Every structure is written in C-alpha cells, then in structure tokens.
Design a protein around this ligand. Structure first.
Ligand SMILES: CC(=O)N[C@@H]1[C@@H](O)[C@H](O[C@@H]2O[C@H](CO)[C@@H](O)[C@H](O)[C@H]2NC(C)=O)[C@@H](CO)O[C@H]1O
Length: 176
C-alpha cells in the first residue's frame, strides 16, 4: 500500500544563493563544486507498506548542450549550464542525469510487512559555458524537471499521485 505525503512543487537550493570559487577558470566548461548545497531532499514523499515495491524515475526538461564525464550538461543560459543528479533520499545516492527522457534514478526497494516511506533528492552544480566581463552571473527561477515513484514487482500506484516537480531557486555566481 502507498499514499502521497509530500509536495508537488519543490524548490532546489536556497533562494538567492551565493556561489563563489577561487579556482582560475582558464579552461571551460568550468564546474562550480557546490557539493549538495543546491538541492532539495525529503525522506518522506510517499508512505508505503505491506510488501510494496517502489523505485524512482527522474526526468530533466532543460536542453542538453553537451556532456562531462558521461553526464549531460543542461543549459540555463548561453553562459551557464548545470550538471544534475536525481535519486533516492540520500544525496550520495544521486544518479547522474543525461537526456530528457524518463530515466531510472533509484533501482528501488520493497517495504516488508510494515509501514515506511519513500523519499527523494535532487542536486545540481552550475557550469560556466561561456565567458563574461562582469564575472558575475545571476540565474532566475527555472523549471528543472520531475521525479516519479515507480512501483514494481506487482505493486501499483492506483490513483495515488506519482509525480513531483522541481524548480531551481534563483542564485548568483561570483567568480573571485
Ligand atoms: C536498512 C534499512 O534501514 N532499511 C529500511 C530503510 O530503507 C527505511 O528508510 C527509508 O528508505 C527508503 C529507501 O532507501 C527512503 O526512500 C526513505 O526516505 C527512507 N525513510 C526514512 C524515514 O529514512 C527505514 C525507515 O522506514 O526502515 C528500514 O527498515
């Protein structure tokens, strides 16, 4: 059994976050290592129980403008892009996203003869694609994509909500 207990619209990263780096940035694309700072995490989005089996699919809607180490660089503006990870609750379990199709981002688990929950997480890292004289780049709130629970091994969502969405909070990049 399962029920939706989270939120449909979720903001990624703190509003007006400030991200800076002391790294030179001589060769692009340059990735800001913001760790999991620009992210959203919730260990409790659906409640499940009684042998329910569920995993997660993820989908990014931003245009793909290239890749880095087998993971797509999604474009936000001509100068800024993102690397994106979606997956189970723990940020560490994030699956590097590529493409714009629904992708398996959490292989899943089966809750035993008890009650528990299924959560999720998303984090992104900003990428400098093109130079700028101002050195500073501000990004506006922007839709990223979505995550959907994937019941398996017989389990079924029924009419319980399966998808939640994500928006990137605005932020600024400050190249020291
Ligand atoms: C080994 C272990 O702790 N197993 C169960 C946990 O998986 C379970 O936690 C839930 O795991 C899901 C899949 O990893 C997460 O999506 C979900 O957010 C997480 N929920 C919480 C509250 O941490 C816990 C809790 O029911 O029980 C264990 O038996």
């Amino acid at each position: 059994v399962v029920s939706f207990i989270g939120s449909t619209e979720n903001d990624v990263g703190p509003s007006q976050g400030s991200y800076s780096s002391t790294h030179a940035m001589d060769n692009l694309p340059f990735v800001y290592n913001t760790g999991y700072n620009i992210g959203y995490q919730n260990a409790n989005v659906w409640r499940i129980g009684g042998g329910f089996c569920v995993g997660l699919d993820g989908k990014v809607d931003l245009p793909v403008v290239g890749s880095l180490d087998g993971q797509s660089i999604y474009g936000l503006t001509e100068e800024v892009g993102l690397l994106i990870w979606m997956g189970d609750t723990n940020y560490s379990r994030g699956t590097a996203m590529s493409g714009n199709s629904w992708e398996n981002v959490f292989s899943g688990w089966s809750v035993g003869n008890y009650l528990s929950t299924q959560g999720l997480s998303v984090h992104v890292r900003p990428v400098i694609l093109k130079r700028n004289s101002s050195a500073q780049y501000s990004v506006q709130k922007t839709s990223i994509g979505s995550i959907r629970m994937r019941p398996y091994n017989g389990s079924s969502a029924g009419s319980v909500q399966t998808t939640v969405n994500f928006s990137l909070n605005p932020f600024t990049l400050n190249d020291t």
